[PDB]
Amino acid sequence: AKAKTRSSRAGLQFPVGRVHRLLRKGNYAERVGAGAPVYLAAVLEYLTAEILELAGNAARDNKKTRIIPRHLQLAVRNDEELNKLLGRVTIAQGGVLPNIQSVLLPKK
């Protein structure tokens, strides 16, 4: 059928039609250009890829194949930028990074 989704056109996995729909209805402005949702979906997809890429490694590192919350937390807090971007975000069931103030370590 000759009806190709805007996502396929922009060559993205994320749903352009939806991001567009969500912008209009979020009362962000009177009008919304046609490229805004494309651009925006492209940016949402990329960040999603960045985190899954790192959370995935964190999983391999624990000899695990399924990403769990812990993995997303290890991924985000070990990455300076993602860490800043999510500086005020709490990932449920993520724990903290193993870290012990040196002065508290036993006197070897």
């Binding site: 812990r70 709490t90 724990g95 903290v96 012990i100 103030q101 036993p106």
Partner: protein
């Protein structure tokens, strides 16, 4: 027999290692649920709670406290101690703006 005893701090260190590894909630659920409901009762009566709503609140509170314990430790260490105290939590909250 050979009354084995670990020196002060060794098991504590062992515990930090363990808990920084895991992610389970550390407060018991029922007691926490009771506290939440009791505090809510002051804002509106005969309220019900989705299971998920209490879990969200507990996840949020523990993450908040664990982080406050982090800055607190930093305040103790700043004062050349390894023992956290109230003055430490109080200083941390004041600088966080939850204080002067």
């Amino acid at each position: 027999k050979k009354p084995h005893r670990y020196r002060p701090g060794t098991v504590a260190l062992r515990e930090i290692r363990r808990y920084q590894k895991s992610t389970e909630l550390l407060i018991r659920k029922l007691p926490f649920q009771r506290l939440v409901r009791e505090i809510a009762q002051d804002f509106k009566t005969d309220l019900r709670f989705q299971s998920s709503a209490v879990m969200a609140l507990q996840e949020a509170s523990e993450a908040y406290l664990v982080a406050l314990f982090e800055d607190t430790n930093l305040c103790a260490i700043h004062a050349k101690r390894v023992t956290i105290m109230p003055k430490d939590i109080q200083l941390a909250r004041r600088i966080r703006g939850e204080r002067a």
